Structure formats: C-alpha cells, structure tokens
Ligand binder design. Structure first.
Ligand SMILES: CC(=O)N[C@H]1[C@H](O[C@H]2[C@@H](O)[C@@H](NC(C)=O)[C@H](O[C@H]3[C@H](O)[C@H]4N=C(N(C)C)O[C@H]4[C@@H]3CO)O[C@@H]2CO)O[C@H](CO)[C@@H](O)[C@H]1O
Length: 343
C-alpha cells in the first residue's frame, strides 16, 4: 500500500521537513528539482542544496522505513515549455537523464519523479516517450554499475488517460508506462475552481459530470493499466470562490471571482475558516466537502471524503494514494485518516 506525500520546498520557512509526520507515509517527495535549460543539467534550485540533502535523513528520523523521491518539474507553463524543448533534443535528453540520476544519488533519494503537465499534443507525447524510455534504461544501468537497487521512477499524470477526454489529441501509453515506471500519481483534482463563475466540487469522486476522479481512474483501467500502478491523488487544499449572493451557498451557486488566497486555501486554513464561523457541508453526491461564510465559499476534501476516497482506491485495487501537499495540513489530519482507512 503506497501512502504518498509531496513536500514543496517553497514552504520551508513555515513548514520545514521536520514537521512532516512521516509515520503516516511510505514515500515522501521533494518538490521540485528544476530542469535548468538550456544545459538540462537537472539540479535543485541553487541555494536549497542543504534543504535537499537534509530532507531524507530528517523525514526518516520519525519513520526510518519511509522512502523518498525527488520530483523534477512542476505544474507551471515554464516547466511545460522546458520539457517540450528538452524532449525534442537527443543530446539534451542524454544530459537530463545522466544529471537526474546523479542528483537522486547525490542527495540520498530512492527515486525520481517527472511532473510534466502535460505531454500533449501527439508530438510532445512521442518525444516524452523517448525521454522516459532512455531514463528507464539508464536507471537499470546505474543499478548494475553501482550495485544498488534501481531508483524508483514515477510520474504525475492528468486525471484521465486521454489528453483530453473531450478532444483527444494524444493519450498516455499505459503498457509503456507500466513497463518503465513503478507507478503514476493521478492528479484527480482541480476539476473546478474560480476560473468558473459557479461553485463546484474541485475533486469530486463521482457525479451524475465527466470531470471526476472515478471517471479518470476508469479510463486508465479500461486502457489496460495494472491497477497497482495507479496512485490516487487527493488535495490538501481547496478551491475558493467569491459568491454572487450570500444566500446562494450550495454547489452550483453563482460566483464572481477567486476567494482567498487567489483561489486556493490550505486545509489548515479551511479548518481556521470553520472555527471562525464558516459552515461545513458534506456533499454525498460528489463525495466532497464545502464551507462558506458571508461571500466566501471553498470546496475541499475533509475527514469523511478522504476516508471515502481512500476506501474507493482500496476497492478499485489501486496501488495507493498521494497527498498534494503536506505543508497544507499542518496537523496531518487527513494523512492520519487516510492511513487508518487503508489499514
Ligand atoms: C514556482 C512557483 O510558482 N512558486 C510558487 C508556488 O507555486 C506552487 C503552488 O501554486 C501550488 N498550488 C497549490 C494549490 O498547492 C502548485 O501545485 C501544483 C503542482 O505544481 C502540481 N504538481 C503536482 N504533483 C502531484 C506532482 O500537483 C500539482 C499541484 C496542484 O495543482 O505548485 C506550484 C509550484 O509548482 O506557490 C507558493 C505559495 O502560493 C508561492 O509562494 C511560490 O513559491
């Protein structure tokens, strides 16, 4: 059972790695190493070398069995642009592969992760295939020469197997992925947010809508992905809106922009929101929660919806679950219920 957490280096001042409850995880990811175009000598952001080095020893002090991976990239457009430039250039791909493996060993990580959002259109999938095939081979070669177990290799994927389900330009090659990677982290959230002028469940497990975690998972399984290669993503943040009218507070209510903070609110801040007078509602239709006060509305996962999602993952025979990102639940409320549920 994979119990995965992502720790983002940006959060180091307020949430250093020592604050992670690593007893609740099997694998903890450092986010992110940078691609470092144009050389593509992959590296942690200069100035964070000590934080990167200390990450794994620190988290293992509370749970020595926990393993770590370093994630390369991130969800931004600059990262996507850099992957697209990288993957078209065979020499650059070689530099990336060599440097990424050396990076993981340098800092004591047990694996590598690619966060490329997303390998589309078709040309970009084709070139990403070249990168990942070369990386898989180099990982196996390094295990042979070094004598150590091979580095784990994972990647972030869109919630759905098709890019995109409403207009298919390419799709994740599941047999390829299952052969070359240990698992994929399915980003089964961010379906709805302040970019829409109505409230919704940002990470709905299901809906009687096609943008749901279950529909996405179904698509990977239908394509032939071994269930154990799928790790279900669960957010530790909510998406927030400003309401058009304070007496329209349910799902589908009209909205007029992003709520705090610029449309995203950590679970810990949502707990504060509720303690400060917001009303929490569990929505059984979507398997999600929302909370509102005056003109602010936030959709998120709570103790009930997380337990239901984790049991869903168990019933669908998935490899496990992941949380993005662990700094957003400072008391580790949701990681605790998730771990208890799978156990
Ligand atoms: C470089 C930069 O923009 N730094 C920002 C920093 O950006 C963060 C946040 O915007 C994250 N958002 C939330 C709601 O947590 C964002 O998370 C993305 C991530 O990139 C993707 N990768 C995954 N994986 C599971 C691998 O999930 C997604 C998530 C969720 O959509 O990540 C970016 C950096 O990539 O934000 C901080 C604080 O706002 C800011 O100070 C600055 O450092």
């Amino acid at each position: 059972a994979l119990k995965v957490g992502f720790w983002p280096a940006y959060s180091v001042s307020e949430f250093p790695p020592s604050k992670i409850n690593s007893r609740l995880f099997t694998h903890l990811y450092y986010a992110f190493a940078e691609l470092n175009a144009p050389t593509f000598e992959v590296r942690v952001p200069p100035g964070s070398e000590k934080t990167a080095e200390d990450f794994t020893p620190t988290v293992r002090r509370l749970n020595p069995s926990v393993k770590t991976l370093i994630s390369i990239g991130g969800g931004g457009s600059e990262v996507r642009d850099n992957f697209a430039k990288l993957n078209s250039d065979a020499s650059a791909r070689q530099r990336f592969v060599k440097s990424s493996i050396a990076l993981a060993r340098r800092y004591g990580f047990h694996g590598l992760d690619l966060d490329y959002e997303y390998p589309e259109p078709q040309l970009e999938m084709e070139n990403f295939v070249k990168l990942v095939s070369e990386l898989t081979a180099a990982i196996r070669e390094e295990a042979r020469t070094s004598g150590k177990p091979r580095l784990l290799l994972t990647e972030a994927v869109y919630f759905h197997q098709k890019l995109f389900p409403w207009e298919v330009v390419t799709e994740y090659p599941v047999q390829f992925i299952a052969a070359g990677l240990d698992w994929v982290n399915v980003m089964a959230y961010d379906f709805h947010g302040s970019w829409e002028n109505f409230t919704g469940a940002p990470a709905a497990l299901r809906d009687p809508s096609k943008f749901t975690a279950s529909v996405g998972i179904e698509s990977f399984l239908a394509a032939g992905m071994p269930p154990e290669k799928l790790v279900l993503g669960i957010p530790l943040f909510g998406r927030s809106w400003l309401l058009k009218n304070n007496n329209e507070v349910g799902i589908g209510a009209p909205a007029v922009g992003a709520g705090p903070v610029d449309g995203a609110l950590s679970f810990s801040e949502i707990q504060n929101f509720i303690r400060g007078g917001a009303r929490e509602v569990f929505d059984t239709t979507t398997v999600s929660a929302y909370a509102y006060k005056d003109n602010v509305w936030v959709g998120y996962d709570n103790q009930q919806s997380v337990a239901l999602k984790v049991q869903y993952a168990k019933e669908k025979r998935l490899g496990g679950y992941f949380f993005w990102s662990v700094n957003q639940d400072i008391d580790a409320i949701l990681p605790k219920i998730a771990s208890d549920t799978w156990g």
